[PDB]
Design a protein around this ligand. Structure first.
Ligand SMILES: O=S(=O)(O)O[C@@H]1[C@@H](O)[C@H](OS(=O)(=O)O)[C@@H](CO[C@H]2O[C@H](CO[C@H]3O[C@H](CO)[C@@H](O)[C@H](OS(=O)(=O)O)[C@H]3OS(=O)(=O)O)[C@@H](O)[C@H](O)[C@H]2O)O[C@@H]1O
Ligand SMILES: O=S(=O)(O)O[C@@H]1[C@@H](O)[C@H](OS(=O)(=O)O)[C@@H](CO[C@H]2O[C@H](CO[C@H]3O[C@H](CO)[C@@H](O)[C@H](OS(=O)(=O)O)[C@H]3OS(=O)(=O)O)[C@@H](O)[C@H](O)[C@H]2O)O[C@@H]1O
Lengths: 50, 50
């Protein structure tokens, strides 16, 4: 979470804007959160089944 | 050549734009290429005359 925040932070506070073209970096935080989600997600249900 | 490329590269990929005012740096690569050109240019013709 904090990661994504840092990116959105470096999106406005970055040396000016209205021209910055990029987005590949965000992909990082994006993919990771997904993997982590589904992992502990169904995992939580497991420790709940008991 | 690679030099100039690096400058044009730091012209778009640089931290945003739509205001960045500068051009003195490019002068560098510009002048150098000219000198080198005319030097080996007529130089090539010399090694060709033979
Ligand atoms: O430096 S780059 O940006 O070019 O590449 C990054 C890597 O350097 C970085 O590895 S490291 O330097 O942190 O050691 C990784 C990891 O970043 C964080 O996010 C991953 C997310 O990984 C999830 O998805 C991958 C898919 O291949 C799985 O292999 C992970 O499983 S495992 O390896 O953790 O067992 C999976 O993790 S998850 O199940 O918890 O979601 C985290 O795993 C890392 O711990 C984080 O540091 O990011 C770029 O690739
Ligand atoms: O010494 S500092 O770091 O403080 O400042 C450097 C300057 O001294 C340097 O100027 S200079 O010493 O090279 O003349 C500049 C520019 O260097 C870059 O270009 C040279 C190649 O020089 C070419 O352009 C100069 C321009 O005056 C010509 O005089 C050269 O022709 S000649 O005098 O050799 O006959 C010309 O050489 S060339 O025909 O072979 O192209 C490169 O060697 C450097 O690597 C470049 O940085 O850089 C600092 O400001």
């Amino acid at each position: 979470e904090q990661r994504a925040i840092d990116l959105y932070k470096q999106l406005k506070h970055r040396p000016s804007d209205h021209s910055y073209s990029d987005s590949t970096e965000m992909v990082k935080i994006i993919v990771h959160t997904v993997q982590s989600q589904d992992r502990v997600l169904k995992e939580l249900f497991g420790h709940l089944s008991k």
